[PDB]
Amino acid sequence: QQKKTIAVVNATGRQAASLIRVAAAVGHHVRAQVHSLKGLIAEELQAIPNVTLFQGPLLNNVPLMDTLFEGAHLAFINTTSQAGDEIAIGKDLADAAKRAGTIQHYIYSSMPDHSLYGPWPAVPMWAPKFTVENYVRQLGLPSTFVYAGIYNNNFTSLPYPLFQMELMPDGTFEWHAPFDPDIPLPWLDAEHDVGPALLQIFKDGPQKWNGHRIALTFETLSPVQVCAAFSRALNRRVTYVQVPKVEIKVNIPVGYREQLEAIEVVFGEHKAPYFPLPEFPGGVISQRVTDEARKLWSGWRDMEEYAREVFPIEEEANGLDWML
């Protein structure tokens, strides 16, 4: 079984980059689109022999999409709002993959539209992906949809919104967010675990996974449990503080601000599930949201491992020195 060529977009993003590194390591050639060739990650991927980068915007650039899928047999597509009209781009990519005629398994990274499951607003950077998912489903090629849990590495002590592990004057850390302190949230070590899981889906094949939604989360932890993991990892006091509104301490694009306001309503006010879809006596065993992901990849890393082994390095690389 010669490893098939995988087409991917937004290659410098955490999800795609995770897949590209391990896919290339096991023999897959990769055709990857990047908005630009500069940057540490783009440079890193360009140096991988099995990888070929195609620089250019996706917005209104079907020709680049046709080039990307040329000769590819598999695809992993994860769009971002930074590239622009996510729905238009997601549909254009799906169409280009079908037109290539060689795509045997198309994995699209989707997210929920909360407004379909309760008296909740749609989270703006998530709902559009669900529209693309519906469109992909009606295309004549096998497709699978993965839903990413919250990234372990969203955490930083820099003053960025929602996931700031704030370093206090006394050396302790505090994480302030709207999430209920005790409701478990789905987490994901994006860099280490997205790739391996995706590869297993491709290995399993389209017959087993066509039409399926898979939650890419390997651990559920309430905010209090997250802080306890950081505390054990760093041997420091780390405490969770539930706040009504997201503390926005830096300037952000308006689209992100609307995303955060939706999060305050969805999670702060309504305590709705992160994955609101329905699917997410003796011997009767109900499936946990982490079941399929763990079956796909047993080598996943938890929050405590991230906090102890990676967080200190990412923090130092960002110039912080609490770990010095």
Ligand X SMILES: NC(=O)c1ccc[n+]([C@@H]2O[C@H](COP(=O)([O-])OP(=O)(O)OC[C@H]3O[C@@H](n4cnc5c(N)ncnc54)[C@H](OP(=O)(O)O)[C@@H]3O)[C@@H](O)[C@H]2O)c1
Contacting Cl ion (CB under 5 A), which of 96, 132, 224, 233?
Answer: 224
Show the tokens assigned to 207.
């017959």
Site size for ligand X, by CB under 6 A?
22
Q: After which residues is the chain broken (C to N over 2.5 A)?
A: 280
Q: What is the largest CA-CA distance in the chain?
A: 60
Contacting ligand X (CB under 6 A), which of 3, 22, 37, 41?
Answer: 41
Contacting ligand X (CB under 6 A), which of 6, 8, 13, 246?
Answer: 13
Contacting ligand X (CB under 6 A), which of 37, 48, 83, 88?
Answer: 83
CA atoms within a 13 Å half-sphere pointing along the CA-CB vector of 266: 24
Show the tokens assigned to 145.
């949809």
DSSP state of 106: E
Report the residue number, 6 or 148, with the smaller CB distance to K ion.
Answer: 148
Site for ligand X in 109-138 (CB under 6 A): 111, 125
CA 69 – CA 93 distance, rounded (Å): 9
Contacting ligand X (CB under 6 A), which of 26, 27, 39, 71?
Answer: 39
| Beta-strand relationship, 185-188 and 219-221 | antiparallel
Q: Which residues pair with 105 in a beta bridge?
A: 74
Q: Is 12 in the site for ligand X (CB under 6 A)?
A: yes
Closest CB 161 distance from ligand X, rounded Å = 12
Amino acid at position 294, single letter: R
Contacting K ion (CB under 5 A), which of 5, 109, 144, 152?
Answer: 109
Q: Of the listed pieces 140-148, 165-173, 247-255, 260-268, which binds K ion according to CB under 5 A?
A: 140-148
- Please choose, from the candidates 57, 55, 71, the residue with its C-alpha nearest in 3D space to the C-alpha of residue 6: 71
CA 254 – CA 261 distance, rounded (Å): 11
Name the residue number minimizing CB distance to ligand X: 13
Contacting K ion (CB under 5 A), which of 148, 229, 296, 307?
Answer: 148
Report the residue number, 132 or 296, with the smaller CB distance to ligand X.
Answer: 132
Neighbour order of strands in the sheet with 165-167: 165-167, 173-177, 238-242
Question: Residue 194, Cβ neighbours under 10 Å: how many?
Answer: 28
Contact residues for Cl ion, defined by CB under 5 A: 3-4, 10, 12, 29, 31, 34-35, 159, 224, 227, 239-240, 250-251, 273-275
Residues in contact with ligand X by the rule CB under 6 A: 10, 12-16, 35-36, 39, 41-42, 78, 80-83, 111, 125, 148, 150-151, 154
- Known binding residues for NADP(+) are 10-15, 35, 78, 129, 151-154
